[PDB]
Amino acid sequence: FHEMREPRIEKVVVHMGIGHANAEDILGEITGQMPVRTKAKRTVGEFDIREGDPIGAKVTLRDEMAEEFLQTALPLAELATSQFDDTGNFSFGLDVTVNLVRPGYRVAKRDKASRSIPTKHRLNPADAVAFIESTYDVEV
Amino acid sequence: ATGPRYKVPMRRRREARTDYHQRLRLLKSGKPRLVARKSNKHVRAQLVTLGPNGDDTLASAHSSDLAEYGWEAPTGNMPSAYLTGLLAGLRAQEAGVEEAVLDIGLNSPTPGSKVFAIQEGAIDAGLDIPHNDDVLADWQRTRGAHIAEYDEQLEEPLYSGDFDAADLPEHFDELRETLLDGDIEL
Amino acid sequence: KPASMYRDIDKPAYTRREYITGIPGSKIAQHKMGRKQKDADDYPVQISLIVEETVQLRHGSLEASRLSANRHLIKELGEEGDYKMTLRKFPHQVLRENKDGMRAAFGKIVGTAARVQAGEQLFTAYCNVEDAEHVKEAFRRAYNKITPSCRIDSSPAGNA
Amino acid sequence: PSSNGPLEGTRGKLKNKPRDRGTSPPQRAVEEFDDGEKVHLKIDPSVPNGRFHPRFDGQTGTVEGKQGDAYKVDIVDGGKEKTIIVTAAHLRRQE
Amino acid sequence: MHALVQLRGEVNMHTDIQDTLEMLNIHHVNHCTLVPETDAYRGMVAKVNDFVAFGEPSQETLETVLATRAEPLEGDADVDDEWVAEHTDYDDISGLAFALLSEETTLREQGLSPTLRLHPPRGGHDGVKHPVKEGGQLGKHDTEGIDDLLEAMR
RNA sequence: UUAGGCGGCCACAGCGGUGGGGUUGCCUCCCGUACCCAUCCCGAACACGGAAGAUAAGCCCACCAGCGUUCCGGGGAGUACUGGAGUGCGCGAGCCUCUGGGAAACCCGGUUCGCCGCCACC
RNA sequence: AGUGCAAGAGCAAAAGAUAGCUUGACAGUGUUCUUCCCAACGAGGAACGCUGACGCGAAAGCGUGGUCUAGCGAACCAAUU
RNA sequence: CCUGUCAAACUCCAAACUUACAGACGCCGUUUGACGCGGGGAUUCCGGUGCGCGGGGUA
Ligand SMILES: [Cl-]
Ligand SMILES: [Cl-]
Ligand SMILES: [Mg+2]
Ligand SMILES: [Mg+2]
Ligand SMILES: [Mg+2]
Ligand SMILES: [Mg+2]
Ligand SMILES: [Mg+2]
Ligand SMILES: [Mg+2]
Ligand SMILES: [Mg+2]
Ligand code: NA
Ligand code: NA
Ligand code: NA
Ligand code: NA
Ligand SMILES: [Sr+2]
Ligand SMILES: [Sr+2]
Ligand SMILES: [Sr+2]
Ligand SMILES: [Sr+2]
Ligand SMILES: [Sr+2]
Ligand SMILES: [Sr+2]
Ligand SMILES: [Sr+2]
């Protein structure tokens, strides 16, 4: 029961919300894989009337790439309980978002007979802090 | 759910099991549907027709009943998918069915996939089905060659239980050979 | 303008403000009088003024009757007396006047009125057995300023 | 009426009851009728094509052949006989 | 079985109501017909309710009216027991009356006109501006009320 | 249907909740990227290959009515409204009687936590 | 929400969005309805066919312009194919 | 939560009633030929009143 209940990292999303790009290059080095362009929506007074146009870049790491990054990434932050989502997620900062979830999360990500994960199988800030804190660092 | 005016989707839609828009287009042919479905371990082919109170399956074949004709191999692969279509196809021919349109449900039209193998299998059984040859994996892969070469990169047998070490696409031939033959007890 | 012009319900309901502009403001000062911080439950006596005929009452009449009614209650129970009275109807019906002969006569907007079916309570007061005859006298003055004849019906009050 | 287009005064008859909103089930859009069959005509708000003139909603005609996938339905408008082209989606068998 | 008598003329009566009377074979004021109590016939009398007098007559009364106003499908031949016996599936007027009231046959089936052309009500009727319950002659009557009327119009 | 596939009706099926279930069986989660195929970046998904583990999700079975929905009883109500008729009443706006139909809100007590068809399957 | 524009209506694994590809906004000829309820009347419009040639898709299929109802013009004469 | 009111261009509801088709009864038609079809001749295209339902208008 506990085996299919113990949390895990689904994805590590590192992104730099600029506002006009050239920054892609560093993310590629700090993470290990190709970054992606970020387009914006709606016209913006702040000389941002152009809808589809580069404004940021992100990277979604999964599995090793995720941990190998967090290893030398988490030590760079001072995690606090507040910095945690209601789903058991947390982000710090260049931004670093960590998406944590239980074993059969795919049930809500597959094409056929997908289903929303029950509030019971959903992760919690509490169960989140633990898992993480239970690995190279401290909470609050 | 929320109130009187709330709109709940059709059941097969909530269950995320039936693409109704694709279904309609499918049914517009007037021909039966070769329903190709797949499980983590198995593959199923059904020849379905329209009915007053629901659909009518006229013939079908599951990868399980493959062993019934001499199959000691796994059932969630290409050779399995093809032969399964062929068996369902053959039985289809038996019940009088002569043509069909491929219904892959919520699966993707990926070139060379198993839903397409099921289709090539059903076609070889003599069923007339609108298709496209260059979307079907090439013969060898259907035989299961891709898995043989994979077992070549051995060091540890690909299959746990022992069906064979370097596997056998030749077994595919035996079974297909057995099906294309008349004697067979459909 | 005479009420004979609008007292009857001889026209479609005309209330949609999304299709009507220039609607004059209501002259009704208040719909809840007396001590509105208190509940009507806290009173032994409840008397209502019931309209005996179905009619339309222009906001100008609601204000005159209500005024002359509450005005009496204030002069008899005090500007803080232990009572409460309610004007439960609101003038939703917009009225017109065609003020050029009968050509393109759709009238211009000139006011508002409340439709009241016979037997309905226009006003309702709640008092103590003491001031029961004072609320009855306020209504006598009120119904003298509205088209129809009215009934002064006593609801909770078995102190006869 | 203020205008005379085909959809004049059709607010009610061409609007779905709230819960019948959304794509309709394919079964009735594929139904097959035989010549001679009595069929009630009623446009399905959710189905754009294959409709007849709204003025005929409520008629109970007679299938007298087909044109492509649509059906040719015979009706009597007042005293005049007319043929209506309509798809199964807007038809229902009588009784 | 109910006896139907038109008491109000055709001028100004709705056409669909006048046609209903004609379908019930009544084409004149004071004309009477016998109608089976069926759902179909029930709607018809209900529609003509305000221009007619109706109800179930007694065996005797029916016999009196048949003897006095019944007529052959064609011809002036008087209708008496002998006529009845020599022309119908019954022995005398009584047998016919019973069969009619029990709804086993109809005046037509027995070669009789479907209509009894009654005489104006002797002593006058109760008026055609109000129903029975209000003291008038219109609408559904008592077996006794219907009998009183039919007899006065024998 | 000791867990499957395709459906019809499209909430009586929704929302929410509780309990129960799987050694070579089923569905899954699950393990894993040489291939077919795949990600404007990610074997996440899609696709392919496969069984070390699991019944915690899903799913299936049993069930709970608090919300939403369906239908039923009793009350509201033969009220509201209404087709036909009237030398009935009212200054009048309007009302009444006879005849034939007949709600809605809401309250209270039940019902409803899907029904059904085809195929396959210890 | 969006879906060019009035209003009312339609639409969620889409009729909306993004990406890519494409030119069916195609030629010929009809059926039917509408215009004009019933009930005769032109231009115009729409739905639905057949034939030809194509686009996309694995395929069923979709595309006779824009989700639907406004955006239109006789004879004579001219120019054009 | 409680408490006071509404809608020609509002509707979770919802009549009476109007209406398509069919069966039944009624009535009608097969020498009075109905229903339908073709052809000749028109007149007519200032209407009015009561009742019901209206919309405009103080009326
Ligand atoms: Cl599948
Ligand atoms: Cl049409
Ligand atoms: Mg309307
Ligand atoms: Mg005679
Ligand atoms: Mg008299
Ligand atoms: Mg459990
Ligand atoms: Mg009078
Ligand atoms: Mg000229
Ligand atoms: Mg030119
Ligand atoms: Na970009
Ligand atoms: Na629909
Ligand atoms: Na489970
Ligand atoms: Na035309
Ligand atoms: Sr008026
Ligand atoms: Sr007065
Ligand atoms: Sr994985
Ligand atoms: Sr007067
Ligand atoms: Sr009843
Ligand atoms: Sr279109
Ligand atoms: Sr009408």
Beta-strand proportion of chain A: 15-25%
Number of strands of chain A: 5
Distance between the termini of chain A: 29 Å
Question: Which CATH architecture of chain A is right?
Answer: 2-Layer Sandwich
Shape of chain D: globular
Fraction in helix of chain D: under 10%
Task: Count the DSSP helices of chain A.
Answer: 3
Could you please say which CATH topology of chain D applies here?
A: SH3 type barrels
Q: Mind telling me the CATH superfamily name of chain D?
A: Ribosomal protein L21
InterPro entries (chain D): Ribosomal_eL21, Ribosomal_eL21_arc, Ribosomal_eL21_CS, Ribosomal_eL21_sf, Translation_prot_SH3-like_sf
Family (chain D): Belongs to the eukaryotic ribosomal protein eL21 family.
Protein name (chain D): Large ribosomal subunit protein eL21
Function (chain D): This is one of 5 proteins that mediate the attachment of the 5S rRNA onto the large ribosomal subunit, stabilizing the orientation of adjacent RNA domains.
Structure, described:
Chain A: InterPro entries: Ribosomal_uL5, Ribosomal_uL5_arc, Ribosomal_uL5_C, Ribosomal_uL5_CS, Ribosomal_uL5_dom_sf, Ribosomal_uL5_N. Chain A: This is Large ribosomal subunit protein uL5. Chain A: It comes from Haloarcula marismortui (strain ATCC 43049 / DSM 3752 / JCM 8966 / VKM B-1809). Chain A: Belongs to the universal ribosomal protein uL5 family. The structure is cut from a larger assembly and holds chains A (140 residues), B (186 residues), C (160 residues), D (95 residues) and E (154 residues). Chain B has helices at residues 11-14, 20-27, 78-94, 114-124, 139-143, 145-152, 169-180; strands spanning 33-38, 43-49, 56-62, 101-103. Chain B has 186 residues and is an alpha+beta fold. In chain B, a hairpin with a 6-residue loop joins β2 (43-49) and β3. With 160 residues, chain C is an alpha+beta fold. Chain C has a single domain (1-160), classed as Alpha-Beta Complex (Aldehyde Oxidoreductase, domain 3), CATH 3.90.1170. Chain C has a five-stranded antiparallel β-sheet with strand order 1-4-7-2-8, covered by helices on one side. Chain C has a three-stranded antiparallel β-sheet with strand order 3-6-5. Chain C starts with 31 loop residues before the first strand and ends in a 6-residue tail after the last strand. Chain D has one helix spanning 27-30, and strands at residues 38-41, 60-67, 70-77, 80-86, 91-93. Chain E folds into two domains: 1-57 and 114-154, Ribosomal Protein L30, Chain: A (2-Layer Sandwich); 58-113, Orthogonal Bundle (3-methyladenine DNA Glycosylase II, Chain A, domain 3). In chain E, α3 packs across α5. Chain E is globular and about 45 Å long. At the B-D interface, α2 of B face α1 of D. Bound molecules: chloride ion (2 copies), magnesium ion (MG) (7 copies), sodium ion (4 copies) and strontium ion (7 copies). The site of one strontium ion has 2 residues of chain C, from loops. The structure holds three RNA strands.
